[PDB]
Design a protein around this ligand. Structure first.
Ligand SMILES: CC(=O)SCCNC(=O)CCNC(=O)[C@H](O)C(C)(C)COP(=O)(O)OP(=O)(O)OC[C@H]1O[C@@H](n2cnc3c(N)ncnc32)[C@H](O)[C@@H]1OP(=O)(O)O
Lengths: 277, 166, 56
């Protein structure tokens, strides 16, 4: 809830990578490479029992061995270690974590564990986030990025990669790029509240599939759009698409009415999204 | 593009595969807005469940190979689908990913289509998203005579134009 | 002499960089960048009183 706590996620001073690896085909390898190439001003701490060093950086055998408390952590491991690793991180004192994978039958335990330690989690099955002005690339994406003034929020990894590639073609940049995943703890309304006050952001673009709290979304969007323009694309208008996405509950004219009442505008298809960028 | 490269249709049943869900959902929305027809898989074609597709892939149309799909998965699926008689046209979507680079995937798809005995009974359509990274792939598709399009909605529109003409 | 003893120079397992720095025009910056891009299998350790971290 508190806007205090998002600072560690969006402006971290140190990051730990759980499961960093020397094997070129591993997720930890890609995350380590991206972070090292980002241009970060803090330390990047690898944690793994299988290597003494990763890409030239001295490693540590386990979480308890770290020299101090990291601001932000990333899990790059199998879902069966999630709860134990989260408990260890909570004991150490970390307050923010990104989770690569998890089944749906784990959500309740994850929420309870996060509440116990006062920790925030970026949705499981999340692609990550990028913040060019801080020189931070904590993501599993293979597309590079540049500095800009536009912010983008997405609930789909493929759309994120596509938009990044389009931006690369046209020599255009961003101020923030965040993927939500399953939106278990951190959700769209909090990010809208945060971005309404960021001095480097002048416009916001969103791709959405579903919502959990309508009133907070409406209030946040209405407040944020007073001084910055906001556009939205929303998919799943047909029964087959709803079945594919598992969003059969709800009605699309309600989305139309809600979007209009908050002062936003809806775009229709992929071409209009590029034109909107 | 369509008049230049696409093989003439023998029917109006469409099949879709992708390495991601949202592009397929956008395709489905566009198809619904124009009153198109989706194909239905037969029970025997469940060789897909056995044929090395991991256990977490759901077998239906559209067939969502996940974000971590590799080129070998594409080739196996293409072979099994082409040996059946359940559809008249096939749409193949590819999004940028580390596990399946664009150029290599395009090359393997081209060879697989070239060497298949029953390829001349169906119409192929390709949609490789990502402007910067798919230039060489689109060039390779052009030399082999396969049609290619920029967005899924455009692909659906091109297909439905010929359906309506017939 | 001491043919044993060149192994550390030519086949080292770890290297320390005295004077590593974040300023792009410094010698330690260039050395750190070259070492990190080399493809080494060991750790590279920076030593300096003026920075908490160097190139991550
Ligand atoms: C949202 C997106 O689009 S992300 C990009 C798309 N990619 C994906 O969706 C695929 C993501 N999934 C994967 O990459 C894989 O399935 C994984 C990582 C989830 C599982 O791979 P697994 O082999 O099951 O992982 P596992 O946890 O057993 O091991 C991973 C690494 O952690 C290391 N490890 C094991 N235990 C620990 C531990 N306690 N602490 C730290 N590291 C550990 C293992 O050594 C292994 O490293 P190594 O291979 O270098 O030896």
């Amino acid at each position: 809830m508190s806007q205090r706590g998002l600072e560690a996620l969006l402006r971290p001073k140190s990051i730990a990578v759980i499961g960093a690896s020397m094997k070129p085909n591993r997720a930890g390898y890609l995350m380590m490479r991206n972070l090292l190439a980002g241009g970060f001003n803090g330390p990047v701490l690898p944690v793994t029992p299988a290597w003494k060093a990763v890409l030239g950086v001295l490693a540590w055998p386990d979480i308890a061995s770290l020299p101090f408390t990291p601001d932000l952590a990333v899990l790059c491991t199998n879902a069966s270690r999630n709860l134990a690793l989260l408990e260890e991180l909570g004991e150490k004192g970390c307050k923010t974590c990104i989770i690569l994978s998890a089944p749906a039958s784990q959500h309740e335990d994850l929420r309870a564990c996060a509440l116990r330690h006062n920790m925030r989690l970026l949705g499981p099955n999340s692609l990550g986030l990028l913040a060019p002005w801080q020189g931070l690339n904590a993501s599993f994406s293979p597309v590079p990025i540049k500095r800009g003034k536009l912010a983008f929020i997405s609930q789909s990894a493929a759309v994120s990669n596509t938009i990044l590639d389009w931006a690369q073609q046209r020599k255009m940049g961003f101020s923030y790029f965040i993927a939500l995943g399953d939106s278990l703890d951190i959700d769209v309304d909090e990010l809208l509240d945060y971005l309404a006050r960021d001095s480097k952001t002048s416009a916001i673009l969103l791709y959405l599939e579903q919502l959990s709290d309508a009133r907070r979304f409406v209030s946040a969007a209405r407040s944020a759009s007073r001084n910055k323009p906001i556009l939205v694309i929303k998919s799943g208008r047909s029964p087959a698409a709803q079945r594919l996405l598992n969003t059969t509950a709800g009605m699309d004219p309600a989305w139309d009415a809600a979007i209009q009442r908050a002062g936003l505008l809806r775009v229709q298809d992929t071409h209009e999204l590029f034109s909107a960028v | 593009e369509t008049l230049s490269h696409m093989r003439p249709l023998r029917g109006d049943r469409l099949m879709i595969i992708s390495n991601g869900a949202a592009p397929a959902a956008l395709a489905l929305d566009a198809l619904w807005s124009r009153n198109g027809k989706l194909a239905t898989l037969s029970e025997e074609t469940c060789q897909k469940l056995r044929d090395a597709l991991p256990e977490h892939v759901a077998i239906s149309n559209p067939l969502d190979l996940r974000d971590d799909a590799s080129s070998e998965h594409y080739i196996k699926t293409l072979d099994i689908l082409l040996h059946s008689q359940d559809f008249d046209a096939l749409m193949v979507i590819h999004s940028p990913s580390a596990a399946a680079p664009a150029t290599e995937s395009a090359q393997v798809l081209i060879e697989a289509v070239k060497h298949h005995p029953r390829s001349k009974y169906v119409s192929l359509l390709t949609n490789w998203c990502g402007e910067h990274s798919s230039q060489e792939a689109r060039r390779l598709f052009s030399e082999a005579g396969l049609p290619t399009y920029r967005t899924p909605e455009g692909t659906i529109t091109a297909f439905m134009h010929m359906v309506e003409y017939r």
